Amino acid sequence: KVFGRCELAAAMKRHGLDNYRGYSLGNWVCAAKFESNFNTQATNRNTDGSTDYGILQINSRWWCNDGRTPGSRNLCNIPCSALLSSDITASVNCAKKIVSDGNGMNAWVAWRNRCKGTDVQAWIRGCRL
């Protein structure tokens, strides 16, 4: 599924991301836009042989099992294919673990580079939240 911006905002809100670890919802919508283009199906291979999955581009090195990332962890206890579902529940739950890990949303390169320090409230403008 390719979410619309406010559609994704609402989904992320219902699943508990708004202000989660102090990151307002716009941070999460922003990060998703530049991670995945709001596409739950997005995958992008990394140099180290891991892959990022889903709307929030969660990495198989630490977070999900994709069966082809040797000596990785699966801290979210999920297959990485769970992260590609039109339903973003698994992605959101895993994102909550990630952002709790020490490094906050710096875990997501697109967030650090495109969202951190920006007017992320813009990403939830217009949405009925």
Q: Give the one residue of 57, 59, 60, 65 binding Cl ion; rule: CB under 5 A.
A: 65
74 binds Na ion (CB under 5 A): yes
59 binds Na ion (CB under 5 A): no
Min CB(116)–Na ion separation in Å: 26
Query: Please, which contacts does 78-83 make with residues 24 or more away whose CB atoms are closer than 8 Å?
Result: 80/51, 80/53, 80/54, 81/53, 83/40, 83/53, 83/54, 83/55, 83/56, 83/58
Answer with the entry of Cl ion, Na ion, none that 39 interacts with (C-beta below 5 to 8 A by kind): none
Answer with the entry of Na ion, Cl ion, none that 87 interacts with (C-beta below 5 to 8 A by kind): Cl ion
Write the DSSP string, 48-72: TS-EEETTTTEETTTT-B-S-STT-
101 annotated to bind ligand? yes
Min CB(39)–Cl ion separation in Å: 13
Note if 35 is an active site residue: yes
- Give me the sign of the Cα torsion angle 38, 33, 112, 25: negative
Q: Give the one residue of 40, 57, 59, 72 binding Na ion; rule: CB under 5 A.
A: 72
What residues make contact with Na ion under the rule CB under 5 A?
Answer: 60, 65, 69, 72, 74
> What residue numbers does the annotated binding site for substrate cover?
101
